[PDB]
């Protein structure tokens, strides 16, 4: 079909952000200024949030055969935009101390927002590929931003080779499915012969690298230690939040995901992700590796809901609310880590042994890390508990007894390291945009508390979005 | 040692107290006196346990 004004209003998120890249690139070539580039980039992402209202004026419809725009995609675009908003506000205080070329940062984050808001809208297997790679190239390059350290370049190179490897597995799987089926459109796929299933397993490999699943999780510690903390805010939250939407939509639409042959394999990956995350996560004394270890377990809880997407309609809202709660928890925690590095400081010295005290140093910021760190676990009065509660309900609904038991025993194992960091901020002690960065994490603390005690308004938004 | 030994006897004493309430209902001595033969028309074997353990 051609371009109609309905299609342009539907495409408005992918458009405002793209116009922002052009204006930011022209502004970089004009002046090369940090203040103007930060202002121009944050205005475009805020303009994308405003235009989410305008696409809500439009209904559930297609733009091209590549994309389908539903109300589900409206919420996922919003999650990615607040993470992009969150990462630029955490990057200005870290980059003020950087020695030179301080302006390429917002350009790459803007490209990654294009990639994230393109995996929200998906209907064809090719859009899946244009999105994964649009976000990886900034994540190829931003973990290597400030390569002057001996580990940022190390982290960039390890992530670079491995992410190209996953994309090559995804592309080879993407074609081996299309050999049987006449089209690669998600809906048109599956219209249980082994080549289609074999092609499907290859896409699971190429998707489970970025979702940090059990035999592909090896990158998640190292780059999270190596990357800058502003990059870790985006790498923990936005990428996997955007990626989880497209992998859920493929199994919802495709009739091959209805068959139990793929279901058993994904359940075992989810089982082992919880276990192989929450047991190796105990011994760590580094906060960045600690959050990277928890990421593997959080994506595992998302999978134990996704396996029962096909049994009961409550799994849609369950995945949605756990993603919202998981966004807020990780942004607050990673913002405090980045807010401790108020200058560039070369290599930031962050560790669990380095976080003795921190309440008599900065009391407000210690409270935010504690609230979010209790929210990661499953303690009530926090939004993580309501998200944990729906995934338990989904597993009970679909009679996945081993999987729901894994979440409980995984929660039982994983309570230990969250609580040490919560109490280690209470042992004996050994600029304007910085106040803005404090405001972002403090705003998130208020939100996770009020949506843990009072969780109904977030459910109303989620059922408003779900089709 | 006296305290331990006297409480062993008191456990032995309270055992008969449970049995008397199970068998004859009221623990008053006189009401027990003219309630004991009324309740004991059929079975007598368990009263020796009550009384021996009372002893």
């Amino acid at each position: 079909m051609t371009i109609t004004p309905q299609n342009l209003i539907a495409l408005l998120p992918l458009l405002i952000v793209g116009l922002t890249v052009v204006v930011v690139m022209l502004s970089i070539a004009w002046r090369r200024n940090h203040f103007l580039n930060a202002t121009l980039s944050v205005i475009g992402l805020n303009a994308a949030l405003v235009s989410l209202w305008f696409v809500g004026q439009a209904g559930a419809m297609d733009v091209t055969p590549l994309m389908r725009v539903d109300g589900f995609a409206m919420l996922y675009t919003g999650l990615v935009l607040l993470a992009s908003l969150a990462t630029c506000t955490f990057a200005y205080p870290w980059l003020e101390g950087y020695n030179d070329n301080k302006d390429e940062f917002y350009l790459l984050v803007l490209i990654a927002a294009l990639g994230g808001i393109l995996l929200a809208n998906a209907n064809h297997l090719a859009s899946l590929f244009l999105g994964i790679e649009l976000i990886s190239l900034p994540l190829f390059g931003l973990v290597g931003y400030a390569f002057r350290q001996k580990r940022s370049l190390e982290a960039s190179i390890k992530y670079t080779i491995l992410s190209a490897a996953a994309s090559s597995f995804l592309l080879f799987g993407m074609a081996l499915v299309y050999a049987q089926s006449g089209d690669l459109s998600f809906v048109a796929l599956g219209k249980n012969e082994p080549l289609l299933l074999a092609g499907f397993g290859l896409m699971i490999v190429g998707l489970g690298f970025k979702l940090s699943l059990v035999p592909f999780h090896l990158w998640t510690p190292d780059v999270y230690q190596g990357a800058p903390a502003p990059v870790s805010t985006f790498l923990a939250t936005a990428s996997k939040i955007a990626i989880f939407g497209v992998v859920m939509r493929l199994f919802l639409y495709a009739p091959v995901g209805d068959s139990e042959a793929i279901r058993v394999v994904l359940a075992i990956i989810a089982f082992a992700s919880i276990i192989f995350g929450n047991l190796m996560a105990l011994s760590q004394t580094n906060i960045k590796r600690l959050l990277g270890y928890s990421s593997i377990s959080h994506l595992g809880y998302l999978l134990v809901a996704l396996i029962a997407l096909q049994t009961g309609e409550m799994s849609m809202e369950a995945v949605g609310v756990y993603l919202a709660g998981y966004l807020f928890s990780s942004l607050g925690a990673f913002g405090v880590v980045s807010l401790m590095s108020s200058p560039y400081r070369g290599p930031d010295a962050d560790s669990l042994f380095s976080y003795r005290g921190l309440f008599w140093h900065r009391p407000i910021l210690a409270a935010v890390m504690t609230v979010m760190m209790l929210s990661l676990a499953g303690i009530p009065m926090t939004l993580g508990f309501i998200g944990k509660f729906y995934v338990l309900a989904v597993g009970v609904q679909a009679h996945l007894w081993w999987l729901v038991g894994a979440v409980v025993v995984g929660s039982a194992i994983g309570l230990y390291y969250y609580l040490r960091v919560a109490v280690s901020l209470y042992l004996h002690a050994p600029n304007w945009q910085y106040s803005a960065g404090g405001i972002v994490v403090l705003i998130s603390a208020l939100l996770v508390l009020v949506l843990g005690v009072w969780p109904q308004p977030l459910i109303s938004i989620v059922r408003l979005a779900m089709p | 040692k006296a305290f331990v030994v006297t409480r062993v006897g008191d456990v032995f004493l309270a055992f008969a107290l449970f049995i008397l309430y199970n068998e004859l209902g009221t623990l008053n001595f006189r009401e027990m006196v003219e309630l004991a033969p009324a309740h004991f028309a059929d079975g007598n074997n368990m009263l020796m346990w009550a009384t021996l353990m009372l002893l």
Binding site: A165, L197, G201, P221, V265, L279, L282 | -
Partner: protein, 54 residues
């Protein structure tokens, strides 16, 4: 024989097994990037095998 409490210790073995198994999993990580790609191949092998037994 009850100077130390037995059943508190014998239901601590979940923590003992978890911590020791967690230490083994940490030692399973290397840092050499060739084995990371070998992990990717060996995940592909087992996923295809687990799909072909279904």
């Amino acid at each position: 024989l009850l100077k130390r409490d037995p059943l508190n210790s014998m239901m601590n073995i979940p923590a003992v097994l978890s911590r020791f198994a967690g230490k083994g999993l940490l030692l399973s990580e290397n840092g050499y990037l060739r084995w990371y790609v070998a992990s990717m191949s060996i995940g592909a092998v087992v996923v295809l095998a687990l799909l072909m037994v279904l």
